[model samples]
Target: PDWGYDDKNGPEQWSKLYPIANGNNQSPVDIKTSETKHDTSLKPISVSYNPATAKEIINVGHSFHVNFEDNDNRSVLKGGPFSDSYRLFQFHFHWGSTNEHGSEHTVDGVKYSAELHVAHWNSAKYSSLAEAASKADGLAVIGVLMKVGEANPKLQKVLDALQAIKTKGKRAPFTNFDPSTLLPSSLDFWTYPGSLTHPPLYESVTWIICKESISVSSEQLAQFRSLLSNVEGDNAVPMQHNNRPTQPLKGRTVRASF
Candidate 1:
């Protein structure tokens, strides 16, 4: 399902959905640093992530995702551009073939090799991500830029697991992995009202993008795109360019955490 399907088009939606791709408040948009407002009221981010919660890695056709067992609040995101505590559900990445550029969210129109999305649901209100993920205040996604550099051992765990699940609908048990190790040192971030980068593009997400970036070697970046976007035939684009183009800023003020 392209997720943009109608009720007759099937898909009762077991997961999440963003607003339709055309809107004033869409996401993966370019950020102009000069236009962002540094808000002192913005509190520092507090991410208490438990690696033990990471259960498995799945090849969801578009990209690979590390899904966590969110039966409890073991891994949660709070503070910093957010008013509610969001339960860590999963984390995934987007990238291109080369290390030069591939990220969806660009700062000052400059692109990066890849981006990481630490996705969470509002556990304080919604019982599950499937229930209210398309509603207001339903989701919070933390975006981190990725650069090509030295091999990151923290990321290699997921990299190593990729060999087991190279195609669509593949799953592998992945436990004892801490999501915190992949984060950059700085907690600084920029936030705005936005939507899911994928379709049924709901404008239900609060975007919290980090200022600093983590690193991955070219070898690591090269393998990031092993998932199947088409999954039907041999026309797979070879893990290159799954990122969507930047959307309109729509006069929404981008608040930064200093």
Candidate 2:
């Protein structure tokens, strides 16, 4: 069956299309700074990558995500001294109708063209991602920024597959691709404890956002726009942007370890 953006098969109906996602702790969320308490000691961590040994997976939504099988363990600030061995689960992108601004996280009142989220689960406490979501220190996410550029060579691998899934619920085989090529040169990032950006608003995630952004070609950006939609039918509006609005800091502190 072909799923277009409209009727009962649109983005809103994703919970039905992907049942596992209904209980998913990670969702789009809005960030609000006014409610947060400023913390100066928080610095962005330097995230190093070696794509040569990583594992990759492509889900039904034409969503391309990467898994870092051998990365180091990640620790939680609020949890006991115990550290959680982290494993990269998947990574996805969020964009807007325009190239000027569409990212979910804002720094000093500035928003970027797009944002990338690489989700990781704590391997120490739970056997699966679903089990970890119920805890306060269950997930870690690394965010990278994206901006419009003349052309992005790395994005071609994924862009080429978009045509196969032009409509909703449509999927195709994505192979022989390495996501590491898409990472930015800079490893600097901001860290904070927050909830999933989407629904059910589970507050068990630790967020690490990179200050810098990666460049994407105008044509590549167009390809992304063509792949997403908002409704369940043919007449449904194209999903130009599926980002959640930023949420309040809620007295939380954002840490940077650059």
Candidate 3:
């Protein structure tokens, strides 16, 4: 059966097909501030991006992602928990049917309205994202939490383009969009070793979650739900609530960058 967010194919059923989903370092873990240790050794996160590399936006069935041209070092993520620079490849969002409970990672048991994932690969050690994805120190993802408050003009640009790629597998040219505009004012974050929130769930990501939240209006979030999980002519299923629940931390330590 095709894996999806439905009760039958969702996260609970993922471990059945991909055993790694039940692994020790799964992502989107509940961040307990009291338990997290402040590590002075952790470097401040630094990002360098070229807007020209923002190529296209596509409806990837599960969610929409803006693909970037990662052939070179035009866009990269450095410092933080990463010993080497990572190349920016694509970025996407995770949301729910309602604002009450959508975000993947929770803060002190509090969930946000939505979440954004900026994906990167360790290009310093590997040639491509695929090869790097198999290694323990391969990928690094920046998680930005979204709260339902003010309308973000930068976010609106992406939301406006959603109309063209309404159906699954649809693609549209999306150029010169700077992803940094979507980030919070503060670069402060919590870092940990974890897997991708979704399946094939590789435990290769060095998860960095921003402490501050960006704003999102209710109307804007509604547009996210307007996307279709099904292709044109198929029974239309809205692509909402695509976020995976917070996984167990096991014995892993979460370090904070202040």
Report the number of the highest-lDDT candidate. Answer: 3
| Clashing residue pairs found in predicted model 1 | 18-200, 18-201, 18-202, 19-201, 19-202, 19-203, 51-178
Q: Supply candidate 1's per-residue lDDT for 89.
A: 92
RMSD of 1: 4.8
Worst 10 residues of 3 by lDDT: 151-160
lDDT of 1 by residue, 1-258 (tens): 544223432123413342265667788889899999989999888999987898999877667888999888999998886778889998898886568788989999899989999899988888888986888788999999988888888887888898887777778999997787888998789999998877666888998999999988888887775555555455764545567767778789898887
lDDT minimum window of 10 residues, candidate 1: 5-14
Tens digit of per-residue lDDT, candidate 3, span 148-257: 99888888789889999999889999998889888988899999999988877999999999999998999888989989989988998988779998899999999999
What's the TM-score of each model vs. the native? 0.89, 0.70, 0.98
Candidate 2, poorest ten consecutive residues by summed lDDT = 73-82
- Please tell me which predicted candidate would have the highest TM-score against the true structure: 3
Q: Rank the candidates by TM-score, best first.
A: 3, 1, 2
TM-score of 2: 0.70
Number of the candidate with higher lDDT, 2 or 3: 3
Error of 2 at 221 (Å): 1.5
Off by over 4 Å in 1: 3-19, 228-237
Q: Write the per-residue lDDT of candidate 2 for residues 105-133, one digit (tens) a residue.
A: 87667777788887777877777778887
